Design a protein around this nucleic acid. Sequence first.
RNA 1: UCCCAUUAGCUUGUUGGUGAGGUAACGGCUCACAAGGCGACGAUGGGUAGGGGAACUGAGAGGUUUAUCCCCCACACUGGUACUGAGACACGGACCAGACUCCUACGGGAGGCAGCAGUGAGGAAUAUUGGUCAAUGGGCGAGAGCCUGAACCAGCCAAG
RNA 2: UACCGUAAGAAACAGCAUCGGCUAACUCCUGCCAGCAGCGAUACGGAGGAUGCGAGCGUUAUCCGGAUUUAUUGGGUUUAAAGGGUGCGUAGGUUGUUCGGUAAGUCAGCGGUGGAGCGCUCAACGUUCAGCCUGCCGUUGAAACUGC
RNA 3: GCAGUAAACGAUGAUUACUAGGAGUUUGCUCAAGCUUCACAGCGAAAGCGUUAAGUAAUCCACCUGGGGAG
RNA 4: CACUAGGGUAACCGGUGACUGGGGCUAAGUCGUAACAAGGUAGCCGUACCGGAAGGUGCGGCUGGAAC
Lengths: 81, 97, 120, 191, 129, 27
Amino acid sequence: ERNLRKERVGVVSSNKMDKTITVAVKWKEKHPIYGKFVNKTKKYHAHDEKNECGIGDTVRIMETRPLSRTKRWRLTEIIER
Amino acid sequence: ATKIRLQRHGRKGYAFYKIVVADSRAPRDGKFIERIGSYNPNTNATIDLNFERALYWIGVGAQPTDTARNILSREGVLMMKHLLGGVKKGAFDQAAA
Amino acid sequence: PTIQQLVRKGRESFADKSKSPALNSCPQRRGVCVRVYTTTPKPNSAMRKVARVRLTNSKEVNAYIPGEGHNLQEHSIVLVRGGRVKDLPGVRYHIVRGTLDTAGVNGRTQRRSKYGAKRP
Amino acid sequence: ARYTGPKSKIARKFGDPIFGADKVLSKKNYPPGQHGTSEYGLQLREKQKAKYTYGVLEKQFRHLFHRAQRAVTGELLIQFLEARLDNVVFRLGIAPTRSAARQLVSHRHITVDGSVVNIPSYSVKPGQVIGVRERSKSLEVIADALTGFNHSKYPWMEWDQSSLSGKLLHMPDRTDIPENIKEQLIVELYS
Amino acid sequence: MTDPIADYLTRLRNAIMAGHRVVSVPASNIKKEITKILFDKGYILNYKFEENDSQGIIKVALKYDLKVNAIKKLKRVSRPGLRKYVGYRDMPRVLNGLGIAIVSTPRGVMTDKEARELKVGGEVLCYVY
Amino acid sequence: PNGKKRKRHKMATHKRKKRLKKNRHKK
RNA sequence: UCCCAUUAGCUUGUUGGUGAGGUAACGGCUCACAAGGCGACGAUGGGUAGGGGAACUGAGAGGUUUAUCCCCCACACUGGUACUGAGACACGGACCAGACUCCUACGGGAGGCAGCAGUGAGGAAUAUUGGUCAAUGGGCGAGAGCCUGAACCAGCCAAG
RNA sequence: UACCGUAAGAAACAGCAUCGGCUAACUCCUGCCAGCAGCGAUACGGAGGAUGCGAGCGUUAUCCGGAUUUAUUGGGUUUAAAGGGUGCGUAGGUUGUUCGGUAAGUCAGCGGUGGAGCGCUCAACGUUCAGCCUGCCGUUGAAACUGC
RNA sequence: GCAGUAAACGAUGAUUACUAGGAGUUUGCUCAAGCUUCACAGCGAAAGCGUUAAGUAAUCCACCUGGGGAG
RNA sequence: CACUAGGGUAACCGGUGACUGGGGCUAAGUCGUAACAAGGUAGCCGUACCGGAAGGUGCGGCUGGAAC
Ligand SMILES: [K+]
Ligand SMILES: [K+]
Ligand SMILES: [K+]
Ligand SMILES: [K+]
Ligand SMILES: [K+]
Ligand SMILES: [K+]
Ligand SMILES: [K+]
Ligand SMILES: [Mg+2]
Ligand SMILES: [Mg+2]
Ligand SMILES: [Mg+2]
């Protein structure tokens, strides 16, 4: 009977750093003024206990407490390689 | 502490008070946690009051001012003595008098 | 333009200039009569009385003197308001009559409040 | 403020006898001035005719107009103008003219529902009682206008002379109010 | 091609302006749905679908009075450069209810009347009157 | 195609091209 | 969640890992390998703004501006350090360093008017060195009660 | 609230040749006036009348709408301002037809959150309930269209 | 080898689909490409454009926001 | 460790300066007549050279030109 934390599904964009990865989340949303639908992307930093993620992977990450200067997410699953 | 008090929300020469639950440090007419009624001393004094919420706040321990204590003494809000299960289980009816 | 062109660039809106920039968004200013002279209109052929005044906002401008008969002179403190004269290039301000050194028009019985004359 | 000026000049300007009967309505009847028209002129004449015949100034008239617009707009503006304390007192016949009714209301002489109201612009809702003050039921001027005249030509006033009161049954329709005002002109001007 | 639906509307409009009796179109599923909607709503005389070796052909015979066409204006709304999405509560009325708007919805392709009846929204393809 | 439109453009080009020649060889 | 590309690269505890210390608490917050991270979806640098609900104003799209009012933030002549406290940018508390101003009796000391009111100057322009804690709200007190330039009022001002 | 003895103590300002509501006579014939057509007088100054508004009336300063004068709703580029000298091409934008998956856009449901009275003698104004929350978030479903 | 300008003009960007007739001309064979002037609907303020649109529509790019100062 | 204070080099934001050059408006005093008609040598665009001044000439282009 707990609360729920934020979850983000994304694509791995960098893994050159030890025990941490970068996840890119992209979505299409409506422009406020002209009403066109444009693409936007955001980059998250996630903590992975093993360097088991290569460049490009549909993954899910979950919100955590600050684990570093810029590290607030943790890996949960790998949808595909 | 959490208090039950009146904010002057009216016009010059016509005082109309709002009965709210607010911190003691907040300004008189500023911030409050919950509105629990109204009060008008100009008539012969009309009082609006949320009985359930007033009971809840006086139970969790909000301290009322003197005038708000009199307003709660009216409308029978201080019946917590009777509702404390004082060696009984029924509910008396003193509102008719 | 196309929708994507508008998304990339957008629309730009300019700012309308103020017709009385020396007032610095004030109704009236105070000045001193640096010079009092006369000018000729640009098909009128009159002799219009003007004063060059240095306002307290660190600016010098030319102010017309409306009415017939002015008691002003050089080095006189005057109140300057907006309003330009069509047939006179340059000047774009008026001097309020009946305020500070400027006196009201003598012998006025109509339009008195526009020239600072009291009820007779 | 109030007009408090010459009335025959306005009467001769507008042609109609807004204030009542006068010899100047038939002798020397022309607009005033030693020297005496666009649709703006006629609209202004109509609006000023309403204002002068009801004793209303410009800001109050505009407030009445847009109140009627909020709640045919020209049709109910006329009944809003009619529903006034001074106008109702004048139509009840207890006072000779509308200026006399306004003065009587402004002075402590008229009560509404038993309480004295001295604002001569108070809107009177239907089903309300307007009556003379019980301390002023025996004035020399107060009786000759009501008694003797006894017009009672309006099918929306109840008089009840036995109590000196009066009641408004309902707001009369635009056809039964004897005012020569084209409300279409005024609503077009203010539109 | 960029907008086949706009091309279909343009072909119909050009045939109406030229005063032809029939008009041919390279077939598509959404255009079959649109011409079915138009025929059941009473804007064209009749239609016919011919499934050939290509994607197919749609032949439309238009409706004229005893010489004014039944269709006055066709206006494409949701173009590729700017897609338009609306709900049932904010759907528009064409010619103050005397014209129709073809709308693609999760329940299918129908007009604004049927869409408001079924309480569903989607894409506004075109205004027809 | 009034003609007087191009006369102003021709005239200011002459002033610009002449102003540069006065200091071309002038070091 | 503002403009400028007549602002194109920025960063070297900067990015991450191990360990330790410190904190109410996670954390390069601090201290002793790998090298990274962020950028044409505008990093970095420069200029200008306190931010919202309100209010005004447009059929709508919206827009303008925070005059009164309410919520959040920052500040108390200018900087630095803290201390006491449940809680501190410490608004009628310190210490030190800088302007500036005032008084001594030349050995020595004081103030910060961004609390309420006089006065002067600046300006086109904005008021009493007023009364009361009677009401509402605060602080202390077992209570009575004491204090409250908050607040209630009054005075002045073509004044909406 | 009540009592005497009295209309007694209380009306200005602007503009009247067109736009605009409101015209005779005297001056001047520069002095002047103006938002524009402009007059230097049915336009300047006074006198008589007139017309607005009214304890206010005008002048100046600032901001919106008409303005579509930045145009998504809702403008244009032969000659009025406006097609790059012409191509190739990077990022980006757009994507013929059809069969299935998914659920990012899209759609729907369910939750959480953020006019009528009464009193001012009337009114501004106070105050209460019916009434929007149509912004954000969570959670269930749909698959025609866009995306994958 | 530099330079990078023009009334570098059809004063008319590229692509795709559709919509009437007359008079010629070149090539490939009555048909399809191209080449220029009169001319329906339509467009335009008008002159005019009119299947080689300045008509009907869709996609992307470039540019304009009164005249001088001033390219 | 840093608040200051001190020297020095480097930026940016600003004033002033012997002297020396554009532009706008008002006057119009002077000098010619470049454009508008085939404006009396058709006009204009680019470029180069040369003149008190508008301009002239050479080379290429256009018709927003006559006239044949
Ligand atoms: K009472
Ligand atoms: K404490
Ligand atoms: K008190
Ligand atoms: K033609
Ligand atoms: K010549
Ligand atoms: K020549
Ligand atoms: K050429
Ligand atoms: Mg008033
Ligand atoms: Mg042009
Ligand atoms: Mg070209």
